Design a protein around this ligand. Structure first.
Ligand SMILES: [Ca+2]
Length: 240
């Protein structure tokens, strides 16, 4: 997260860290959202490479024991059937991970709230992006969870020529673009929490930013619109 601030230790309990094994150590690669005690929602591009993945819940500082973390392996990966690695702009950047075991819920580990199917947010809706991703374009990962206020930019505006143009679809949500705050590498797959009816709900899964850099004016961070995949999500969890 570029231009963010350190999040309170228990502000976003559904946030998870998706890590892969590198030799004899683990490395953070993406964010995600705990949606069931044994299911995690993340971006499909986070699991394109065939590596060994593990999920960490109740995490705050990546480099030190907080005494609240739970480490669980990934048993099965279900990527959306239409996902195409060579065309992230085509959408469908979403995947579900079945955990090897159910995690225990407490003040640091809670399920994320999903929006009702089809819900579209008005322009400039209040949302926050969270993650341990780069704090600057071509920078380094954050040690502690960061958050940044990223109001939404409706489809009409986001798909205009001055912004993303035809690169963005209605199955996506745009947020930010002020040239100061944005998601960045390492935030992928993470949540976009938006306040609706007094409750924070996860409306997006971080998908992509500009090739020119993370925080670029008129190039808001793009997220997979969760509300467009509710039926798919429910079908997978109830089936597997
Ligand atoms: Ca830790």
């Amino acid at each position: 997260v570029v231009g963010g601030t350190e999040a309170q230790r228990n502000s976003w309990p559904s946030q998870i860290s998706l890590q892969y094994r590198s030799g004899s150590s683990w490395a953070h690669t993406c964010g995600g959202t705990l949606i069931r005690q044994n299911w995690v929602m993340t971006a499909a591009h986070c699991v394109d490479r065939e590596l060994t993945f593990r999920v960490v819940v109740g995490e705050h500082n990546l480099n030190q024991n907080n005494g609240t973390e739970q480490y669980v392996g990934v048993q099965k990966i279900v990527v959306h059937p239409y996902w195409n690695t060579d065309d992230v702009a085509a959408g469908y950047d979403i995947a579900l991970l079945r955990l090897a075991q159910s995690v225990t819920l407490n003040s640091y580990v809670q399920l994320g709230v999903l929006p009702r199917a089809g819900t579209i947010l008005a322009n400039n809706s209040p949302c926050y992006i969270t993650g341990w991703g780069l704090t600057r374009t071509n920078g380094q990962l954050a040690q502690t969870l960061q958050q940044a206020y990223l109001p939404t930019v409706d489809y009409a505006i986001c798909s205009s020529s001055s912004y993303w143009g035809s690169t963005v679809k209605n199955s996506m949500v745009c947020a930010g673009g002020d040239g100061v705050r944005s998601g960045c590498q390492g935030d992928s797959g993470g949540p976009l929490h938006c306040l609706v009816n007094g409750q924070y709900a996860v409306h997006g899964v971080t998908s992509f930013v500009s090739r020119l850099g993370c925080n670029v004016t008129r190039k808001p961070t793009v997220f997979t619109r969760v509300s467009a995949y509710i039926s798919w999500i429910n079908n997978v969890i109830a089936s597997n």
